[PDB]
């Protein structure tokens, strides 16, 4: 019974009871998880930073052109909000975000489905050559 088999997890939850037997160390936990006094302010700052840097990418990186095996795929989808949050979180931790920066070029076509996207002039209507500095600033702010 998937998604309801938490009771077996309850058994592994019994392993957490071992941490109780480490009373001498649980005080450390009592000073970390209960340290949520100045934590809410910085947490609100970081979540509002995520909000302002997430809603701003939707319109500027619209029609992300998800394609198989080109570093921008269905798993790398961006137009969906939760997946955009996932992508920005992946970029935040530094997991090969250089490839993400290199995946948005002025000469790269982004979903050639619109009517004025027939490549009559040989132009890809997708600049996106500003996310480098923006994501560098985001990384610096999150680290700070």
């Amino acid at each position: 019974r998937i998604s309801i088999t938490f009771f077996r997890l309850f058994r592994v939850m019994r392993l957490v009871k071992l941490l109780s037997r480490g009373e001498g160390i649980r005080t450390l936990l009592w000073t970390f998880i209960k340290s949520f006094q100045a934590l809410p302010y910085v947490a609100l700052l970081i979540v509002m930073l995520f909000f302002i840097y997430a809603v701003i990418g939707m319109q500027v990186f619209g029609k992300i052109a998800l394609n198989d095996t080109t570093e921008i795929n269905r798993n790398n989808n961006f137009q969906t909000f939760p997946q955009a949050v996932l992508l920005l979180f992946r970029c935040a931790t530094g997991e090969a975000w250089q490839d993400i920066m290199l995946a948005c070029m002025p000469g790269k076509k982004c979903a050639p489905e619109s009517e004025p996207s027939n490549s009559t002039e040989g132009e890809t209507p997708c600049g996106s050559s500003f996310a480098v500095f923006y994501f560098i600033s985001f990384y610096m702010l999150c680290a700070f």
Binding site: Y41, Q59, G94, A96, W97, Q98
Partner: protein
Amino acid sequence: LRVLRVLRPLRAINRAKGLKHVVQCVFVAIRTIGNIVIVTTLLQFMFACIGVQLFKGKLDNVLAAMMALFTVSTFEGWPELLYRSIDIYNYRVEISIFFIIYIIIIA
């Protein structure tokens, strides 16, 4: 410039006052940070001029090519540089160690 209507948190987060001084100190030391960046860039300019005038002879810039490489060499990509270069070939590899020292200087 479409949905810029999120000014409420700016007024709402003005209660703790434990980080406004932090922001003030950061934005008052940013001048010294920029001066240090400038002097490191001058050192990079010196080293690049020496290296490209003495080696790296063609068969970006003396003050910008190293920065452009650093954009992919933030300690995540310089090991990638070594990984790619492990295959000119051995002509002035010391730049990599220079890319160590400069980074070390930054580090």
